[PDB]
Design a protein around this ligand. Structure first.
Ligand SMILES: [Cl-]
Length: 141
């Protein structure tokens, strides 16, 4: 495809549940700006996919598509913590726990060849490594 794919790291499993319930997410300022630029410059040509993992959990927990630009002025305090400013919409595609052992072989040439499972929040994944990750997530039993 023409997709672009980002890792999402959360310190809050509660915020993930809320995001699956209401189809919204929010990253840092720096993270919002990264995802905003990628979504807008995409013009609707392809999908922005988001690969979610909770920090320390040892597993990825699903896949969602970014479904709107970033709105930086929205209701405060909707998450577990107050630090988040803004909102954007998502559509969750897969909601399943996939152990990091299933993905650790995939390394990112744009991240000093580190395993994809050792990425920080909003790390971008090269397209062919991303299609690798998505195949494993979709097919995992
Ligand atoms: Cl690429």
């Amino acid at each position: 495809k023409h997709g672009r794919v980002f890792i999402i790291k959360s310190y809050s499993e509660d915020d993930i549940h809320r995001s699956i319930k209401y189809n919204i997410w929010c990253s840092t300022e720096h993270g919002n700006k990264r995802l905003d630029a990628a979504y807008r410059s995409m013009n609707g040509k392809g999908p922005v996919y988001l690969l979610f993992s909770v920090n320390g959990s040892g597993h990825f927990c699903g896949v969602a598509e970014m479904k709107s630009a970033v709105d930086y002025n929205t209701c405060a305090g909707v998450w577990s913590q107050d630090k988040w400013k803004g909102r954007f919409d998502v559509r969750w595609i897969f909601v399943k726990d996939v152990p990091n052992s299933q993905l650790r072989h995939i390394r990112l040439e744009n991240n000093e060849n580190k395993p994809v499972t050792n990425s920080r929040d909003t790390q971008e994944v090269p397209l062919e490594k991303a299609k690798q990750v998505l195949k494993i997530i979709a097919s995992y039993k």
